[PDB]
Every structure is written in structure tokens, then in C-alpha cells.
Amino acid sequence: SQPTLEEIRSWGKSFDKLMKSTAGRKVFQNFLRSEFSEENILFWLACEDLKKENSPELVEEKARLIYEDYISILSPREVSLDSRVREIVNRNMIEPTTHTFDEAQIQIYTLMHRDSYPRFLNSQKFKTLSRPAAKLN
Ligand SMILES: [Cl-]
Numbered sequence: 833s834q835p836t837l838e839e840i841r842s843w844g845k846s847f848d849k850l851m852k853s854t855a856g857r858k859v860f861q862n863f864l865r866s867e868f869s870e871e872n873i874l875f876w877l878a879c880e881d882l883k884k885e886n887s888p889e890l891v892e893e894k895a896r897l898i899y900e901d902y903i904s905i906l907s908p909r910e911v912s913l914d915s916r917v918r919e920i921v922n923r924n925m926i927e928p929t930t931h932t933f934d935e936a937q938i939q940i941y942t943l944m945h946r947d948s949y950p951r952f953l954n955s956q957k958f959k960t961l962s963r964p965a966a967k968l969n
């Protein structure tokens with residue numbers, strides 16, 4: 833696949849536009865990987881996926897894995913959460929729901945929005961992706 837130039841430039845109008853695009857998420861995730869922070873978007877995507885789950889048994893099964901992969905010391909590299917949010921998530925993990933990670937997910941979305949997103953816009957990758965093609969005639 834390959835996104836149109838219109839789609840690309842839309843990512844630069846708002847983070848929302850970027851995050852709502854299947855293509856925009858991947859390029860953004862590639863940029864985050866280059867920045868050693870791709871765990872931020874992967875955690876965020878895992879939380880969105882968890883929200884789709886209706887069965888409480890599977891909510892718990894998937895939630896335990898999200899905690900292990902992104903929040904616990906077991907994680908290869910955990911997302912950055914303050915102690916207030918960590919304590920809330922810990923308590924929510926006793927009987928997981930689809931909203932167990934809401935506080936952490938928001939904190940991480942705000943992080944990507946304010947820290948890594950401006951740098952993605954200023955990146956050579958985005959600046960090059962944003963260049964038109966020649967119109968031959
Ligand atoms: Cl924005």
C-alpha cells in the first residue's frame with residue numbers, strides 16, 4: 833500500500849488526523865522506533881484493541897498481557913507512568929475491565945501528542961513524504 837499526498841499532509845494538521853489513519857500510525861510508529869519510544873504507540877494500540885473485548889474472562893487475559901508487556905518491570909521497556917496512575921492501574925487489575933488502563937492510555941496519548949509528534953512533523957522523513965511528485969507534460 834501507499835498513502836496519497838493528501839493523506840500525508842493531513843497528518844500535519846492535527847495529531848488526531850495522524851492517529852485516525854491506518855497509514856499514519858505506521859509511519860509514526862516507524863519514527864517512534866527510530867526514537868526508542870515505539871512502546872508508547874504499541875501500548876496505546878493495545879488499549880484500543882482491549883476495548884473491543886466484551887467477555888470479562890478475555891478482558892482479564894488480554895489486560896494481564898498488556899500490563900506485563902508495557903507497564904511491569906518484566907517489560908523490555910515500560911511506558912512512563914507517574915505513581916498516581918500506576919497505583920490506579922494496579923488496583924484496576926484485580927478485576928480488569930475495558931477501562932482498566934484509561935488513565936495510563938491518556939497519559940501516553942498526551943505524551944506522544946506533545947513530545948514526539950512535534951518532532952515527527954519536523955523530521956526529514958515526514959518532510960520528504962510531504963513533497964509532491966513532478967507533473968510531466
Ligand atoms: Cl494537534
Ligand SMILES: [Cl-]
Pocket residue numbers: 918919922
Ligand atoms: Cl507499581
Ligand SMILES: [Cl-]
Pocket residue numbers: 937938941
Ligand atoms: Cl487516548
Ligand code: NA
Pocket residue numbers: 885886887888891929930
Ligand atoms: Na467488556
